[PDB]
Amino acid sequence: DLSFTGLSDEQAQELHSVYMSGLWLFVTIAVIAHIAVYIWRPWL
Amino acid sequence: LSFTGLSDEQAQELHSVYMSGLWLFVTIAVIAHIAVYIWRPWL
Amino acid sequence: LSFTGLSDEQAQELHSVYMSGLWLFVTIAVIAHIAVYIWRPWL
Amino acid sequence: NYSHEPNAVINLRVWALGQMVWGAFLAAVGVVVVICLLVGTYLAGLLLPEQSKQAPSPYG
Amino acid sequence: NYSHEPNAVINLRVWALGQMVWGAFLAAVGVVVVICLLVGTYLAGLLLPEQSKQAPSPYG
Amino acid sequence: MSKFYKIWQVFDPRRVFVAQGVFLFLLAVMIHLILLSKPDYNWLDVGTAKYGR
Amino acid sequence: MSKFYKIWQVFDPRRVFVAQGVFLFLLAVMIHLILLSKPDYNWLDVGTAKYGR
Amino acid sequence: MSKFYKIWQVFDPRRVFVAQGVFLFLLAVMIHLILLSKPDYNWL
Amino acid sequence: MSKFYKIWQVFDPRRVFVAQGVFLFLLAVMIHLILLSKPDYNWL
Amino acid sequence: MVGVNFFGDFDLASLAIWSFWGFLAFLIYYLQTENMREGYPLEMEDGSVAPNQGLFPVPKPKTFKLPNGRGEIVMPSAENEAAHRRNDLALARTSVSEGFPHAPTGNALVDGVGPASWVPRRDEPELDAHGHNKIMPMALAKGFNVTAGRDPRGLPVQAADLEVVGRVSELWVDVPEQMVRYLEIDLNSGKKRLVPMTLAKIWADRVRVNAIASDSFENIPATRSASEVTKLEEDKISGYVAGGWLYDADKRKR
Amino acid sequence: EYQNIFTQVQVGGAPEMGLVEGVDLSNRTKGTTNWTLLGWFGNAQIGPIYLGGWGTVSLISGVLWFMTIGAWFWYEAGFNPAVFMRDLFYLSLDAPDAKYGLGVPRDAEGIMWFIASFFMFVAVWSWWIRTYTRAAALGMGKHTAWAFLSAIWLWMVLGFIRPILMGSWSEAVPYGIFTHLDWTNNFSLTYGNLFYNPFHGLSIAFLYGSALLFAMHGATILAVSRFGGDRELEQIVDRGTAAERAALFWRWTMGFNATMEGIHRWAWWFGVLVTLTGGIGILLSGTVVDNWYVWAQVHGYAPV
Amino acid sequence: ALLSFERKYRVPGGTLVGGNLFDFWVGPFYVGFFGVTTFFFAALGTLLILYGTAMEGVWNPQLISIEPPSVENGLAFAPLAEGGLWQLITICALGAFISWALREVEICRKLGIGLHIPFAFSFAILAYAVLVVFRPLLMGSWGYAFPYGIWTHLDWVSNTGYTYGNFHYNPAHMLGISFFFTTALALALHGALVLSAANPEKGQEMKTADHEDTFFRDLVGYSIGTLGIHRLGLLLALMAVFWSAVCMIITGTIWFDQWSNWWYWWVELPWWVDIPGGVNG
Ligand SMILES: CCCCCCCCCCCCCCCCCC(=O)OC[C@H](COP(=O)([O-])OCC(O)COP(=O)([O-])OC[C@@H](COC(=O)CCCCCCCCCCCCCCCCC)OC(=O)CCCCCCCCCCCCCCCCC)OC(=O)CCCCCCCCCCCCCCCCC
Ligand code: BCL
Ligand SMILES: COC(C)(C)C/C=C/C(C)=C/C=C/C(C)=C/C=C/C(C)=C/C=C/C=C(C)/C=C/C=C(\C)CC/C=C(\C)CCC=C(C)C
Ligand SMILES: COC(C)(C)C/C=C/C(C)=C/C=C/C(C)=C/C=C/C(C)=C/C=C/C=C(C)/C=C/C=C(\C)CC/C=C(\C)CCC=C(C)C
Ligand SMILES: COC(C)(C)C/C=C/C(C)=C/C=C/C(C)=C/C=C/C(C)=C/C=C/C=C(C)/C=C/C=C(\C)CC/C=C(\C)CCC=C(C)C
Ligand SMILES: COC(C)(C)C/C=C/C(C)=C/C=C/C(C)=C/C=C/C(C)=C/C=C\C=C(C)\C=C\C=C(/C)CC/C=C(\C)CCC=C(C)C
Ligand SMILES: [Fe+2]
């Protein structure tokens, strides 16, 4: 129904799925790197 | 009455979703302030 | 959706070539990073 | 006749490289101009009396 | 539609650069393979007993 | 408490969203910097001290 | 949480993505500099000392 | 992870490629100048 | 001095450009390896 | 009154600086409200009225009583905005979202959009105190003579495509200000057309107009009178000409 | 590519003598002049002036002021023209000695200063009244007088008021080209560092803001002069694409904008607030604050 | 977000770099390539200011100060805690300013108006650079530049000016002063004139340019014209900043002593030196 952008729930779910894929990839990389930096030099 | 063009139902849905997000934010924040109070209390 | 005028096929092609070049870049860069760890390590 | 690449992928690849290198050339031009600016400044400063590099500090 | 360069000179320039860089990439591949060959050789030599690097010279 | 959703019959979600996003980011940055300037909560200096570096 | 996808019924991908790139790169540079500011956590000088260089 | 090709439906690729060229060259000079500053990591 | 363009009537330019790429890259590595050999001119 | 703190460290100096902060706040209010007499209420791209009408409220209407019996103008008002409102706009939304452009559907120099836009000022000319028209051709302006500079009249008019289109004929002048606003062209096509002096660079041998190319010099809006020119025609002309710095650039050479 | 800085073609005609809106035409002149050196950057007509009563007051008093200072310059120079044209900048009608306090100085230099100052008083106030009247006769608003009054406020604070509050005409400014500079320096040095006078900082803010603003306004109006933006009075009432384009430039740039009348309102304040804040900050110097760096330390903008 | 007339101008084009990528608006604001750059640089510089004062432990906005490296550091890059922050903030500030100018350019050519405004701004960037980039390089060290503190760049001004005695005697400084004063003057006069025409006595009609010209001819015998006053104030500001940049680039590079000793070349001209009279006899 409401769309200030034109996208209907369908295109929205599609775009969201891909965006979240990218986000979880980014986050995986960052988690790996944080674990590493903890091993090498902890900060807590 | 609607200064933005919404109806009560569009608003109610938007608000359920906003509330979901807000409660998720608050949840993570609570987890973190807890971990902190366990690691270096400020009270 | 197509904001830029491109279709899924054209976009697939363009992405294939882009990521070709990307993996080339990362290959060269990891090589050079290795050689530098050889020269002046930093960890 | 010459310059004709039959393949679609090779045509796309040489185009994108051209675009990327164009941008990098722009950036290099800018960096080089900045460099010439600052370096010519320093050099012209070497032409100045020795009291220029003696001046007291304002502490700031 | 995209990838269309109106100008004749810009089309020729991006083509020739592609050709030149292709050749340089071939040369780099060759150099890198040679390098990996020799370096892996040296390393595998580091796995060998110490008497390998002690051997007398033939003077030649 | 049962008609808060009516706020969106007042304000436009685009603006509200951008505003609160900026607000939260700056708030977080300021609190983090505050701690970072108090050396008893500077997690970096602490971890240096706790781990002897 | 089930319906977060409606965010793109509010915002446009283009401006959102520009924002995201800018903000993430800014944040990364900021934190890297934060670290390089400490005589510790400065990987460069740390490695310099560790290897006695 | 496989539907990332959809970014070229969002952004014109010509300009994106020029911009990446700029960004990467500038990042390179940034780090080289960062490293050049340090005597341990300077090579000249 | 102005009629040198006639070389492209002698040699196919495609192959000549590839060959120049090779020649120049190889010359570069040659001199870099020559310089790297000398401690005074080595930078690593 | 040295070392006299009313309370704490607060003395006349502190009181004065704080009073100034307060006055300044009121003053920013005043000015950013008086900058609202034109343009508000805020619109969407749909032409509607939007929810965000600013955090500063639109002020109370004032009145401008015009000279020469041109009437009363009230700002802010609906008549003011509706008169200067353009309609039948050749524009197409680039996206359903807001904050993105709107492309010109047709020829923009003509359709009056973008840098080539004009505003419906009133088709009555600009007047001096005496009520005589402000812009007269130098021939009706009794006593007006070139007192200096290069007299352009009769010089060819080179355009952005480097081609030539006509010869200057007459100079339109601001009599009360004693300066040249517009210059007229005797075009090859047998037509007369004005062009602002600020957009024409008098060389020794010619007049250069790098704004527009030659195809455009013919479709320039005309004047219903050859001795006067109204504010409307001025805006149309000036917009048309200035739009060539964007919409005729593929033609501009050198 | 014509930026409209220098006028290309000049035109002229019979001089524009004036507009009779209640002006006394006999107190007006009838001779004009053309001088193209200006026509290149502005109007060339060195047009008729108004010779009125207040104007005569001002001219007479101020000429007496000028020539009085020149007289003391001569006496201070040994009547040697070469000394005059040598020490011209180093000379001064220095201010009275502090011994006299606020009494009529019992010296020559001092009373000459006092009299020259009386003349300046008469001149400046006559000129202010002349502004008011010339704007009242043409039926215009008195904005120019209330702007000048701001300048007068500072000038008074420096010559008349601040000293009366401090009890010495020594505090007032000498009439010289280098001695009033020395006075400013010694004023700062005596009272802390004037920079820490918040009202000094504000007057500076508004001076820099006045330059900022006039460059902005002028560059805009020359940018939109191709749509007749120079004619402003007619874009307040009959808005055109000039005003719209300027407003939208500043909106798209910094998020807010103004109107062809409200920018003029902004200008009238950045101008007068330069001398309203200065007057206050000078009044408070020595009467309320003997040192400003310490006031800062105490008030938190300067460190302990 | 739009004004009642903002639409027909929201068309594509007028972009030096970029294209469709970045031809959009965010609220009232236009953001192109250079908008993105200026936002990034500004934000980074701001956050670094805050971290610098955080490391210091200062949180008062008036006492916050990020200072340049020592003078002994010379022109090398320093540790972030001893000048590196100031230097990065300078980099970011300059990028931000130049990008603001180029954004103004993009907008000026989308709205089809001249490029006078970015030109004017360029002089200010030039002066900032004169202070933090050029003058140092010629003087040999970054530490001769000013700090990023509200009340500390004033201390830099004071100390730098008292290095050469009363800076008032620098002539280029005199001209800067004079043009600044005349700028404020002309600004007030313009505003007052226009408002006095548009907003006259009660019960009277609006006035016109003729009345302005006549009032100022009456007052001082000359009127510069509606265009000439804008021209004039613009040039006044520019020449002011020009003289101000000229005054500083020659202070510690070509001149080294008190500035008063400069005017003594007029005294010391042989045909009025020995004369015993006046101040200098
Ligand atoms: C604990 C405290 C906490 C904080 C407290 C804060 C409280 C805040 C309250 C709100 C105050 C807001 C004031 C700003 C509004 C003005 C807006 C505007 O631009 O135009 C309005 C608008 C202008 O009208 P218009 O559009 O031009 O057209 C009107 C006519 O149709 C045609 O016009 P016209 O030709 O008939 O008349 C033109 C005139 C319309 O106004 C007038 O005609 C009257 C203007 C006032 C003139 C003076 C009054 C007469 C007596 C003066 C006494 C002077 C003594 C010296 C000897 C005598 C000299 C004559 O236009 C104006 O622009 C008027 C504003 C002028 C302001 C004053 C500028 C000069 C002052 C320079 C300094 C000198 C004094 C020293 C100050 C420091 C002292 C420590 O006028 C009004 O709205 C009413 C007039 C307001 C009366 C004055 C009150 C405000 C004065 C504030 C001055 C600053 C004080 C310092 C601040 C504190 C520091 C510590
Ligand atoms: C080293 C000394 C101190 C210092 C000491 C002072 C003192 C002392 C004063 C200021 C004042 C000012 N200083 Mg300073 N000032 C310093 C540092 C600075 C710096 C800087 C970058 O460091 C700047 C930019 C400023 C800025 C300023 C101005 C903002 C302000 C005066 C504005 C004005 O219009 O005055 C000039 C304006 C007038 C005098 C108006 C006079 C108008 C009348 C009507 C003239 C009559 C005309 C007459 C008849 C002539 C006829 C001519 C013919 C008809 C042609 N100063 C240093 C640190 N400064 C003033 C102020 O407000 O103090 C807070 C002031 O008195
Ligand atoms: C000063 O204080 C300090 C810094 C010390 C401490 C504080 C730090 C703070 C406050 C840090 C905050 C960090 C935050 C808030 C981080 C948030 C990160 C997020 C939200 C990251 C999201 C990343 C998402 C990514 C990378 C997504 C990428 C997606 C793609 C590349 C593919 C998407 C493809 C699409 C859309 C194609 C489909 C499109 C169409 C049109 C069909
Ligand atoms: C030196 O000074 C110190 C600070 C030390 C001492 C002095 C302190 C002072 C002066 C303190 C003063 C405090 C005051 C005056 C506080 C006042 C607070 C108030 C009035 C707070 C009000 C809060 C209101 C809230 C949070 C309202 C929330 C409302 C909602 C979330 C409901 C949403 C509304 C909707 C949806 C509207 C419905 C719309 C339609 C169309 C149906
Ligand atoms: C001196 O000061 C210090 C800092 C020391 C102490 C004081 C600190 C203060 C004053 C702190 C104040 C903090 C406050 C006021 C915090 C407030 C936080 C809030 C209200 C956070 C809210 C977060 C909400 C979130 C993240 C919501 C997210 C929602 C979504 C992702 C979904 C968006 C909506 C959608 C998709 C629905 C669209 C549907 C349709 C039909 C269009
Ligand atoms: C060529 O030689 C001849 C003799 C022919 C002519 C030459 C003339 C020359 C060389 C003239 C030079 C004049 C100069 C250098 C003038 C410079 C004046 C300057 C720079 C003045 C600066 C500031 C002055 C101020 C702030 C004075 C303010 C004074 C007042 C506000 C007066 C207020 C009233 C006072 C002091 C008391 C009297 C009051 C009453 C009611 C009687
Ligand atoms: Fe104006």
Query: What is the DSSP secondary-structure string of D17-45?
Result: HHHHHHHHHHHHHHHHHHHHHHHHHHHHH
Closest by CA position to L43, among listed J7, F26, J109, J138 = F26
> Do residue G9 and residue A2 have CB atoms under 8 angstroms apart?
yes
Break positions in chain I: residue before each gap, C to N over 2.5 angstroms: none
User: Angle formed by the axes of helices K198-223 and L116-129, to 10°?
Assistant: 140
**Smallest Cα distance from D46 to chain L, Å:** 7
Those residues whose C-beta lies under 8 Å from the C-beta of residue L205, and which sit 6 or more positions away, are J65, J66, J67
Which sign, positive or negative, has the C-alpha torsion E8, E13, E15, E16? positive
Instruction: With H, G, I as helix, E, B as strand and everything else as coil, classify residue K93.
Output: strand
Q: How many CA atoms lie within 13 A of I5 on its CB side?
A: 2
Please identify, by atom number, the ligand 3 atom nearest to the C-alpha of residue G30: 4
Q: Is H32 annotated to bind ligand?
A: yes
Query: What one-letter code names the amino acid at K304?
Result: V
Instruction: With H, G, I as helix, E, B as strand and everything else as coil, classify residue L255.
Output: coil
Instruction: Report the 10 Å Cβ neighbour count for L265.
Output: 8
The position carrying tokens 């104030």 is L233
Cα–Cα distance measured from residue K213 to residue K202, given in angstroms and rounded to the nearest whole number: 16
Q: Produce one character per residue of C11-30: b if its CB has 16 or more CB atoms within 10 Å, e if not.
A: bebbbebbeeeeeeeeeeee
Structure token pair of residue K95 = 């201010």
Given phi > 0 = left and psi -120 to 50 = alpha, else beta, which region is E56? beta
Closest by CA position to L103, among listed L173, L14, L191 = L14
- Identify any residues that bridge with K9 across adjacent strands, giving them in sequence order: J149
Cα–Cα distance measured from residue K300 to residue J216, given in angstroms and rounded to the nearest whole number: 65
Structure token pair of residue L246 = 């000229």
Cα–Cα distance measured from residue A16 to residue G16, given in angstroms and rounded to the nearest whole number: 13
Structure token pair of residue L7 = 């639409």
Q: CB of K177 within 8 A of CB of L206?
A: no
CA K171 to chain centre: 21
Please report, for residues F16, F22, J158, the alpha-carbon distance to residue F19 in angstroms, rounded to integers and kept in the order given: 5, 5, 53
User: Angle formed by the axes of helices G13-37 and L33-56, to 10°?
Assistant: 30
Cα–Cα distance measured from residue D5 to residue F9, given in angstroms and rounded to the nearest whole number: 60
Distance linking the first and last C-alpha atoms of chain I = 43
C21 to chain E, any CB pair closer than 8 A? The answer is no
Those residues whose C-beta lies under 8 Å from the C-beta of residue G35, and which sit 6 or more positions away, are F44, G41, G42, G43
Given phi > 0 = left and psi -120 to 50 = alpha, else beta, which region is C5? left
Taking the C-alpha atoms of K3, K6, K12 and K15 in order, what is their torsion angle to the nearest 10 degrees?
A: 110
Q: CB of K168 within 8 A of CB of K114?
A: no
Please identify, by atom number, the ligand 4 atom nearest to the C-alpha of residue F5: 36
Instruction: With H, G, I as helix, E, B as strand and everything else as coil, classify residue C6.
Output: coil
Q: Where are the extended beta strands (E) located within chain J?
A: 62-65, 72-75, 91-93, 102-104, 135-137, 145-149, 156-159, 164-174, 179-187, 192-196, 201-202, 207-209
Cα–Cα distance measured from residue F34 to residue L50, given in angstroms and rounded to the nearest whole number: 10
Cα–Cα distance measured from residue L127 to residue L148, given in angstroms and rounded to the nearest whole number: 16
Q: Are strands J201-202 and J102-104 parallel, antiparallel or unpaired?
A: unpaired
Distance linking the first and last C-alpha atoms of chain H = 43
Cα–Cα distance measured from residue L278 to residue L280, given in angstroms and rounded to the nearest whole number: 6
Cα–Cα distance measured from residue L109 to residue J243, given in angstroms and rounded to the nearest whole number: 9
Structure token pair of residue E31 = 């150099």
The CA angle J59-J63-J68, to the nearest 5 degrees, is 155
Q: CB of K148 within 8 A of CB of K128?
A: yes
Which chain E residue shows the shortest CA-CA distance from I20? Answer: E20
Query: What one-letter code names the amino acid at L39?
Result: F
Instruction: With H, G, I as helix, E, B as strand and everything else as coil, classify residue I43.
Output: coil
* Chain E residues 26-55 with CB within 8 Å of chain H: none
Q: CB of L250 within 8 A of CB of L172?
A: yes
Please report, for residues I42, K125, K185, the alpha-carbon distance to residue K280 in angstroms, rounded to integers and kept in the order given: 69, 20, 18
Provide the H-helix boundaries in chain L: 33-56, 84-110, 116-129, 135-139, 153-162, 171-198, 209-220, 226-249, 264-267
Provide the H-helix boundaries in chain K: 36-39, 53-77, 81-87, 108-137, 143-156, 162-166, 179-190, 198-223, 233-237, 241-254, 262-287, 292-299
> Would you call the peptide bond into K96 cis, given omega within 30 degrees of 0 as the criterion?
no
Query: What one-letter code names the amino acid at K82?
Result: A
Those residues whose C-beta lies under 8 Å from the C-beta of residue D50, and which sit 6 or more positions away, are none
Cα–Cα distance measured from residue L62 to residue L152, given in angstroms and rounded to the nearest whole number: 9
Closest by CA position to K231, among listed J129, J134, J73 = J134
Please report, for residues D49, I33, L165, L263, the alpha-carbon distance to residue L257 in angstroms, rounded to integers and kept in the order given: 13, 55, 8, 12
Which residue out of J1, J17, J20, J23 has the highest number of ligand 1 atoms within 8 Å of its CB and is therefore the one to mutate? J23
Cα–Cα distance measured from residue L167 to residue J82, given in angstroms and rounded to the nearest whole number: 58
The position carrying tokens 């970054």 is L142
Q: How big is chain B, counted in residues?
A: 43
Instruction: With H, G, I as helix, E, B as strand and everything else as coil, classify residue J91.
Output: strand
Given phi > 0 = left and psi -120 to 50 = alpha, else beta, which region is L82? alpha
Q: CB of K101 within 8 A of CB of K167?
A: yes
Closest by CA position to L181, among listed K271, K91, A3 = K271
Structure token pair of residue K265 = 């309102």
Q: Is F8 annotated to bind ligand?
A: no
Please report, for residues J157, J196, J197, the alpha-carbon distance to residue J200 in angstroms, rounded to integers and kept in the order given: 9, 7, 5
Cα–Cα distance measured from residue K38 to residue L274, given in angstroms and rounded to the nearest whole number: 43
Instruction: With H, G, I as helix, E, B as strand and everything else as coil, classify residue K291.
Output: coil
Cα–Cα distance measured from residue K79 to residue K209, given in angstroms and rounded to the nearest whole number: 45
Which H or E run includes C23? helix C8-39
Contacts of residue H43 in chain I, CB cutoff 8 Å?
43-44
Instruction: With H, G, I as helix, E, B as strand and everything else as coil, classify residue L14.
Output: coil
Instruction: With H, G, I as helix, E, B as strand and everything else as coil, classify residue L24.
Output: strand
Structure token pair of residue E60 = 């030649």
Closest by CA position to L144, among listed L157, F19, K302, J103 = L157
Please identify, by atom number, the ligand 5 atom nearest to the C-alpha of residue G6: 36
Spacing, Cα K146 to ligand 1 middle (Å):
8
Burial of K82 per CB tally in 10 Å (0-12, 13-18, 19+):
middle
Instruction: Report the 10 Å Cβ neighbour count for J156.
Output: 16
The position carrying tokens 């080209």 is K177
The CA angle J20-J23-J24, to the nearest 5 degrees, is 80
Residue J97 DSSP one-character state:
S
Cα–Cα distance measured from residue J174 to residue J176, given in angstroms and rounded to the nearest whole number: 6
Those residues whose C-beta lies under 8 Å from the C-beta of residue D58, and which sit 6 or more positions away, are L144, L155, L156, L159, L160, L163
Taking the C-alpha atoms of D15, D17, D20 and D25 in order, what is their torsion angle to the nearest 10 degrees?
A: -110
Q: Are strands J156-159 and J207-209 parallel, antiparallel or unpaired?
A: parallel
Distance linking the first and last C-alpha atoms of chain E = 67
Instruction: With H, G, I as helix, E, B as strand and everything else as coil, classify residue G7.
Output: helix
> Do residue L144 and residue D51 have CB atoms under 8 angstroms apart?
no
Q: CB of E23 within 8 A of CB of I21?
A: yes
Structure token pair of residue L42 = 């500004």
Those residues whose C-beta lies under 8 Å from the C-beta of residue K49, and which sit 6 or more positions away, are K28, K29, L217, L218, L219, L220, L221
Chains H and F touch (3+ CB pairs under 8 A): no
Q: CB of K144 within 8 A of CB of L220?
A: no
Contacts of residue B14 in chain A, CB cutoff 8 Å?
2
Instruction: With H, G, I as helix, E, B as strand and everything else as coil, classify residue I12.
Output: coil
Structure token pair of residue J155 = 């010089």
**Smallest Cα distance from H40 to chain G, Å:** 6
What are phi and psi for residue J209, nearest 5 degrees? -130, 90
Contacts of residue G51 in chain C, CB cutoff 8 Å?
41
Q: How big is chain A, counted in residues?
A: 44
Cα–Cα distance measured from residue H37 to residue J32, given in angstroms and rounded to the nearest whole number: 49
Q: Are strands J145-149 and J179-187 parallel, antiparallel or unpaired?
A: unpaired
Q: CB of K11 within 8 A of CB of J173?
A: yes
Cα–Cα distance measured from residue L84 to residue G35, given in angstroms and rounded to the nearest whole number: 13
Instruction: Report the 10 Å Cβ neighbour count for I15.
Output: 11
* Chain L residues 254-273 with CB within 8 Å of chain K: 263, 266-267, 271-272
Closest-CA residue, ligand 6 atom 4, reads: K70
Query: What one-letter code names the amino acid at L178?
Result: S
**Smallest Cα distance from H43 to chain L, Å:** 16
Provide the H-helix boundaries in chain I: 13-37
Q: Produce one character per residue of K139-159: b if its CB has 16 or more CB atoms within 10 Å, e if not.
A: bbbbbbbbbbbbbbbbbbbbb
CA J122 to chain centre: 13
Ligand 3 lined by H7 (C-beta under 6 Å): yes
**R_g of chain C, CA atoms, integer Å:** 17
Contacts of residue J95 in chain F, CB cutoff 8 Å?
none
